[PDB]
Design a protein around this ligand. Structure first.
Ligand SMILES: O=C(O)[C@]1(F)CN(c2ncnc3[nH]c4ccccc4c23)CC12CCC2
Length: 167
């Protein structure tokens, strides 16, 4: 038993809710919240900009030190950093950005990072400003992640389309 509430169950291990991931994290304080990161951990907009704003820019300060030490992530890769006031940990995962021409096949590799964590609160990778089809992203999530994932979808219209079209 965990503290996630109001989710629709899609599969044995994947759950979905129309929710603002920032507000959901603030309430649940999950062990892991996933950020929709880029390779530079520049949290300017989308989910990343919203998560970072909710930490009063502490996420960005920590991220800049991480990059200065380690260099950029790979597309499809991840790193674990602090969850600040939102979660114990933040798993920064880089899905491919279609608006940069990155290979959508890397979306599966991105979701594989979730399997290193037993339970996660997450957005749909490569959705939103990353330019991928969220229905495809949901399919890859379900077919790749084996651990327990609670997906927060900000847009109500999109949430209803994802549910209604789910196979
Ligand atoms: O940035 C994108 O492209 C996204 F479409 C946005 N997303 C979100 N997913 C859940 N909660 C959210 N709260 C937010 C508050 C402000 C801005 C965005 C979000 C958001 C998902 C997304 C990250 C990859 C697709």
């Amino acid at each position: 038993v965990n503290s996630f509430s109001g989710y629709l169950k899609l599969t044995d291990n994947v759950y979905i809710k129309n929710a603002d991931i920032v507000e959901e994290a603030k309430k649940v304080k999950p062990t892991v919240v996933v950020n929709a990161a880029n390779v530079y951990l520049k949290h300017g907009g989308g989910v990343a900009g919203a998560l970072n704003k909710a930490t009063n820019n502490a996420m960005q300060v920590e991220s800049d030190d991480y990059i200065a030490t380690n260099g950029p992530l790979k597309v499809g890769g991840s790193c674990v950093l602090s969850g600040h006031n939102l979660a114990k940990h933040c798993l920064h995962v880089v899905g491919p950005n279609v608006n940069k021409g990155e290979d959508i096949q890397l979306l599966k590799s991105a979701y594989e990072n979730f399997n290193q964590h037993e339970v996660l609160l997450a957005p749909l990778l490569s959705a939103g400003i990353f330019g991928a089809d969220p229905i495809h992203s949901l399919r890859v999530c379900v077919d790749t992640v084996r651990t327990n994932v609670y997906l927060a979808v900000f847009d109500k219209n999109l949430y209803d389309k994802l549910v209604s079209s789910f196979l």
